[PDB]
Amino acid sequence: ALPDFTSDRYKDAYSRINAIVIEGEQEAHDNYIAIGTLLPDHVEELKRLAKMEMRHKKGFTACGKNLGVKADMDFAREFFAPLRDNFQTALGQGKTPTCLLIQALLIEAFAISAYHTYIPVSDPFARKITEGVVKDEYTHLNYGEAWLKANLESCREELLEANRENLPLIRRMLDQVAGDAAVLQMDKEDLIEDFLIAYQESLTEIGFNTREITRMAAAALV
């Protein structure tokens, strides 16, 4: 059953979830612009992807305002810090495959799962905004898949390392958000299932085989 969007219980949980989504979208904008420094010939396309993320950020900010919720931005900045630090380390080292696995694969799959899971339990205003964001996230996943597919033979080992290092951070993020997501009437098992399907499908598209993907998804056990 649909949550009571007006309750103090719902608004409290929404203040943290809404802040996480707003921060995630800002970091996604910043990440695609940063990847433009590593792929100078991709700048115009990366600018278009980054502009989409800012449109998403604005839409999710309006979701919070619509419910009379003040987003807990400090909570959201801490939530992304471990993954943000790994993206910044990779960026500084010029490690384009790791930057793309973090943003274009892991984060886009986590957003797709979160948005798909939220849609059926969302208020009417946020439902339309969320439905209107999901198609773009598939475009972002496709962009990352395409580059990694084209460059797989040169970056195989780096991707296995990036997955080993960062997939457990996504799992920790899922563990951390689960309580508030349950107040929002979202089941953690649906979040995990949708995320693993999106991520496993992206890896298949890139060119990893069933054994490789199984070994990769098992990195979440750390």
Ligand X SMILES: CCCCCCCCCCCCCCCCCC(=O)O
**Window 127 to 186, contacts with Fe ion (CB under 5 A):** 137, 140
Distance CA 150, CA 79 (A): 32
Q: Return the one option of Fe ion, ligand X, none that residue 181 interacts with (CB less than 5 to 8 A, by type).
A: ligand X
| 193 annotated among ligand-binding-site residues | no
| 140 annotated among ligand-binding-site residues | yes
Q: Does 216 bind ligand X (CB under 6 A)?
A: no
In 3D, which of 132, 130, 137, 151 has the Cα closest to residue 104? 137
174, 116 contact by CB (below 8 A): no
**Window 74 to 113, contacts with Fe ion (CB under 5 A):** 108
Q: Report DSSP letters for 50-94, one per residue.
A: HHHHHHHHHHHHHHHHHTT----HHHHHHHHHHHHHHHHHHHHTT
95, 31 contact by CB (below 8 A): no
Question: What is the amino acid identity at position 146?
Answer: A
Distance CA 90, CA 106 (A): 15
Distance CA 87, CA 101 (A): 9
Q: Exposed/middle/buried for 204, CB within 10 Å: 0-12, 13-18, 19+?
A: middle
| 25 annotated among ligand-binding-site residues | yes
Q: Return the one option of Fe ion, ligand X, none that residue 107 interacts with (CB less than 5 to 8 A, by type).
A: ligand X
Q: Does 53 bind Fe ion (CB under 5 A)?
A: yes
Considering beta carbons, is residue 110 or 143 the nearer one to ligand X?
Answer: 110
Q: From the CB of 181, what's the least distance to ligand X, in Å?
A: 5
Q: Return the one option of ligand X, Fe ion, none that residue 60 interacts with (CB less than 5 to 8 A, by type).
A: ligand X
Distance CA 59, CA 80 (A): 20
Binding mask 54-93 for ligand X (x = CB under 6 A): --x---x--x------------------------------
Query: Pick from 83, 100, 162, 181: which binds ligand X (CB under 6 A)?
Result: 181
Q: Does 115 bind ligand X (CB under 6 A)?
A: yes
Q: Does 21 bind ligand X (CB under 6 A)?
A: yes
Which stretches of the chain bind ligand X, using CB under 6 A? 17-18, 20-21, 24-25, 28, 53, 56, 60, 63, 107-108, 110-111, 114-115, 118, 126, 130, 137, 177, 181
Summarize as ranges the residues that interact with Fe ion (CB under 5 A).
25, 28, 53, 56, 108, 137, 140
